[PDB]
Design a protein around this ligand. Structure first.
Ligand SMILES: Nc1ncnc2c1ncn2[C@@H]1O[C@H](COP(=O)(O)OP(=O)(O)O)[C@@H](O)[C@H]1O
Ligand SMILES: Nc1ncnc2c1ncn2[C@@H]1O[C@H](COP(=O)(O)OP(=O)(O)O)[C@@H](O)[C@H]1O
Ligand SMILES: Nc1ncnc2c1ncn2[C@@H]1O[C@H](COP(=O)(O)OP(=O)(O)O)[C@@H](O)[C@H]1O
Ligand SMILES: [Mn+2]
Ligand SMILES: [Mn+2]
Ligand SMILES: [Mn+2]
Ligand SMILES: [Mn+2]
Ligand SMILES: [Mn+2]
Ligand SMILES: [Mn+2]
Ligand SMILES: [Tl+]
Ligand SMILES: [Tl+]
Ligand SMILES: [Tl+]
Ligand SMILES: [Tl+]
Ligand SMILES: [Tl+]
Ligand SMILES: [Tl+]
Ligand SMILES: [Tl+]
Lengths: 468, 468, 468
């Protein structure tokens, strides 16, 4: 906090302070202030901007907002050359100092408050498992005469034939085979561990690291859960460390859900549970150790899944991952074993660790809005005792049409998720967490992104239709 | 001052002294003298030149002028290899030692004197927000067979498709999107902070630093306000540090108003206020906390805007920024919210900080002449109680022809600004600040620059007319 | 006419008929119809289109218009591979069959009618002297990262140093020196004569051909005068032959007014005279053999010059030619000798050949609208006895400020010419020749072209301002 922060300034001879926050789409933003500009004043009323310059926050008249430093988030940047301290901020409306309707962090905080207000529980626990890719070269573009994307990495199976200037060494993970081969097949041990050390120096707690399924560098660093809002902060720090350590090693990292057709996409499973006075409200006598409270939570998520998709799978690319695969978590059902089920129930020893894992989210999701939406849906399931029906332990739709298998599924496109969010918005507006304008603003930003993809001719359309 | 300067010579074992001053166009100039040439004599009567060699100062007969060191400006150069002390100078006429009519610094000082002489206030406060671009490669030329300009930077969105020799890393700001993404999208954190540290070592006080809106490296370092003339000095030091730190990092910086069509231009908003005995003469009971004195100041600026343009937007390029955009500050009106308004009224807490922000200036402007012109116009607004009319809080001309929206606007071209300055020159000649010859000399220099642009075929004219 | 046309179809075994017309900007357009589609019907009511597809003619609702073949214009295309007959058309409104307000050809015809209606004369004679350039290679472009134009030709003086694959032969016209050197310096004798033979095969009458002043291929083919509308038709045929013969010889021709800075631009002087019952209404007892009727004509042109500019110099490029040169015809005065005068009075033997030469037009001008505007202005000079004042036989403004030499001049920019046309529109609306919508539509098209040039950074601005 304030008192502590002034200490860190001298302990580390800090020269600058990097004010950070997240935009509507979920991208961390920043502005730097010299250390000498930090004072008593600054902490109680923050510093403001010429904001009319950000996206989905742009009001023609009322362009000015306030940056409120959260003294608890203070952490040293491990990359910058001059000693600089990062301080996450909240965006508050001037004078009122209440907390901008469109500020994703404020929204997540409101949802945490509302949890307590309803007395259903006092804390929400989140454990995302975000995956990513490390490449050596990424090129792309689109103009009137065409479009293209070219991915390249030393691990790419396609390079088995490539001439290298010191010789092709040839130990690389094949398609869907990068799982756990030891080095030299796995070329990222040193890279992943650096990411872990740095993540920890930034307040995160690492549980594990490993290469993922896809060829061409899919990797993962598993970090420990935490309270909802703090965890979304951690996700932003996580992405920052990944992006920058990658950069510092001559790589380029991406959190895109599906960079390649034919190999694994990157997902962000979300483990969750509620608690009250140190008791796990999700352990009980019901299915797999679940409380009935947990089942209503599930029911809520299943009822509002398509709307949640607009936040957990916010890109058109997200829908290229959530494609009728067999492992692809698209079926709106729960199970402890079935992998077609978008909600896995971790079979676990201690009741203290009982929870649910919503598998459909991907890393492109704004952690704040996605996490909050998951919660609000779960709470609407509890407030309204929405029974999640029976578990789907049998086997996926590849167990094709048995009754056509008309099991509820996730949105099949962004346009559809956006639609769902438009209509099914009430559960989010509860407790005044999400406002209509906040929701409409979001829908509009994403709608223009969807347009670019729907309007621009796709390379495959030529393969399919040029000789029509 | 003199006494102090002789100290710095020994404290830093200074080997050279760099005499600096600014030409009519606003470019800092210099000549170096060995430290041993500094003495008692030098400070009281300066050292002179073979001046007939400078532009707009060139008189065929009377070519000799005097360089008068201002001992208060002494500062060490942070780039030069041999210890050298910079000393800003004033250009005085020989014998009389009065202060050259065409010397921009002398002109700014005369305007500060005149403020006090009229007793309207004792000090003028200026806070420019100059923006700039950092590129990797800039090429251009014009000959009988053609013309061309090619800009290139690692951040340029157009490079998303470029092959790089170690691989394209791909994290770059899209068009109009370089605003606040954290690194690696923002590639200039280390660069900006170095600029800040150095600026401070040169007497400036930094308030903040951040990437700007445009792709391809638009950046900004916000420095604290100061008295008019001292601030124009600071602008020259600011440009020097930016240009040289950029150079030292393998970049090239430009303060051009509009290097690229389709993305943000660089502006130099000017925050201003007057004061007397430590009281802010701009706080009052009127609109948004303004005094009536502030409104008359505004009235003056609006009345003489087109003439001020000739100094605040002195290039033909300036007019490619001040183009009917929606954010483009071209409407001669004041408002606390409306962004179409070329004069924003900072909505602020403390009356101590009340002021106005004239948004149309750009960095190509000679800080001295531009600042002085702004003042002289404001004073003519006060001396003559020119009511600024009513505020324009409604909404910009994109709120097209409602009455054709015949709101006063800034000059639409340099030729027009020069014209305005020609005719509307009286407010500048007040107090003998600006002389006719000084003004005519300036108009002529700029007029020949305008000619080159008006006379040389433009690439786009071929796109438009070759098949005519 | 109709009867004759059906003859030519069999005499030349015509396979196709090319329907041609001119758009608002002045570019010839076409659509091809098989010869078998020509019949009785076709001539009396034409064939129509899905027109909503043309520029400045685009009405969202009422998109359909009629193509009315003018049987007198029938001529064989000398380039097309299959025998095809060209037939110029008029654009008429459906049902009414009256003649589109925005059809440039209809407008020229209305102006010829109006001449007769006022009884001032029965025929208008026009003799344009359009100049052009023949290049070998022309490249240009503009994107967010830059712009460029590169001209190249075997005659370009800059190629004196170029390595050619069979050796540089070295006989080329220097800057401003391509005037009349005999071949091999003049490399276009064969090219020009082919153009002449073809022009004649297309109904034109050639008076002379020669190389022009500029290096890099400026050339000219002088054709005989003719009645106003027929002459504008001839100009379109002229441009067609030039463009296509050039193409057929491995060259590329342009009618741009000023492709290069530093050498001659291309102009289109317009010789004019009026007649009644075979008598030249311009010969008289007044100045240089002129009638007083001729002087009033001149007066009219001088009064409405800036408005006429919007049609005779319709491009931003046009204003790079009409630049204070000494030979540059920018002064609104008449003279038999002075070359600063934009209106030369040909000193000639026979009274039968007395006329005036308005020198400021360039080839980018829509011949119909430009010619019509010249006439309408001259007629307004006659109807209102506007005395042209006294002749300017002395010497040009290079005979600088003698009284500042406040002689009327042509528009200094397109924006200004467009302005003039906006305000000074009445003389054109006379006789219902030009309608308001027709004029406003034109002004809008050109206004968007002016925008591209005013908004796009110019290469020279970097030369001048990058180090600002
Ligand atoms: N209530 C809870 N109790 C215990 N662990 C939890 C709870 N809520 C969330 N978690 C989180 O489950 C996450 C880890 O999953 P993991 O299976 O190791 O990832 P991956 O198999 O995708 O590499 C951790 O972040 C873990 O701490
Ligand atoms: N009278 C005044 N009182 C307080 N601040 C002033 C006064 N006059 C000018 N200023 C200046 O306003 C300027 C800063 O603006 P800023 O909004 O941070 O820039 P940007 O948003 O363009 O990055 C500073 O240079 C500030 O010190
Ligand atoms: N009334 C007229 N009587 C005679 N000639 C006329 C008349 N009106 C226009 N003309 C035209 O003047 C034009 C020629 O000019 P010219 O000086 O040979 O061109 P250039 O010197 O530019 O190569 C011809 O097209 C000529 O027929
Ligand atoms: Mn995983
Ligand atoms: Mn998992
Ligand atoms: Mn800015
Ligand atoms: Mn500002
Ligand atoms: Mn000629
Ligand atoms: Mn001529
Ligand atoms: Tl900005
Ligand atoms: Tl896995
Ligand atoms: Tl995965
Ligand atoms: Tl010199
Ligand atoms: Tl800007
Ligand atoms: Tl000539
Ligand atoms: Tl010419």
């Amino acid at each position: 906090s304030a008192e502590h922060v002034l200490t860190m300034l001298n302990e580390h001879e800090v020269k600058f302070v990097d004010l950070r926050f997240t935009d509507t789409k979920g991208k961390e933003q920043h502005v730097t202030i010299p250390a000498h500009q930090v004072n008593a004043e600054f902490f109680e009323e923050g510093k403001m901007f010429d904001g009319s310059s950000i996206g989905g926050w742009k009001g023609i008249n009322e362009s000015d907002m306030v940056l409120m430093p959260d003294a608890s988030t203070a952490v040293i940047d491990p990359f910058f050359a001059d000693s600089t301290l990062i301080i996450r901020c909240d965006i508050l409306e001037p004078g009122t100092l209440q907390g901008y309707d469109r500020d994703p962090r404020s929204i997540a905080k409101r949802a945490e408050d509302y949890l307590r207000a309803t007395g259903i529980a006092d804390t929400v626990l989140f454990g995302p498992e975000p995956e990513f890719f490390l490449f050596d070269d990424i090129r792309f573009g689109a103009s009137i005469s065409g479009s293209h994307v070219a991915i390249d990495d030393i691990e790419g199976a396609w390079n088995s034939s490539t001439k290298y200037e010191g010789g092709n060494k040839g130990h690389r993970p094949g398609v869907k085979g990068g799982y756990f081969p030891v080095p030299p097949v796995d070329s990222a041990q040193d890279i992943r561990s650096e990411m872990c050390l740095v993540m920890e120096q930034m307040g995160l707690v690492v549980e594990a690291h490993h290469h993922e399924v896809a060829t061409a560098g899919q990797n993962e660093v598993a970090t420990r859960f935490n309270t909802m809002t703090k965890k979304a902060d951690e996700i932003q720090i996580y992405k920052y460390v990944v992006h920058n350590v990658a950069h510092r090693f001559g790589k380029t990292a991406t959190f895109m859900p599906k960079p390649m057709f034919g190999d694994n996409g990157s997902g962000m499973h979300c483990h969750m549970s509620l608690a009250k006075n140190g008791t796990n409200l999700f352990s009980g006598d019901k299915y797999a150790g679940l409380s009935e409270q947990a089942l209503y939570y599930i029911g809520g998520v299943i009822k509002h899944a398509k709307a949640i998709n607009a936040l957990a799978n916010p890109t058109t690319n997200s829908y290229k991952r959530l494609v009728p695969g067999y492992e692809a978590p698209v079926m709106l059902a729960y199970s402890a074993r079935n992998r077609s089920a978008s909600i896995r129930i971790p079979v676990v020893a201690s009741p203290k660790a009982r929870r649910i894992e919503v598998r459909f989210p991907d890393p492109a999701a704004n952690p704040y809005l996605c996490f909050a939406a998951l919660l609000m849906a779960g709470l609407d399931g509890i407030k309204n005792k929405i029974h999640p029906g029976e578990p789907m332990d049998k086997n996926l739709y590849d167990l094709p049409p048995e009754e056509a298998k008309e099991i509820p599924q996730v949105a099949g496109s962004l346009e559809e998720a956006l639609n769902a969010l438009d209509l099914d918005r009430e559960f989010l507006k509860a407790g005044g967490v999400f406002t209509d304008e906040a929701i409409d603003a979001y829908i509009a930003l994403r709608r223009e992104e969807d347009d670019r993809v729907r309007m621009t001719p796709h390379p495959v359309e030529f393969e399919l239709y040029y000789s029509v």
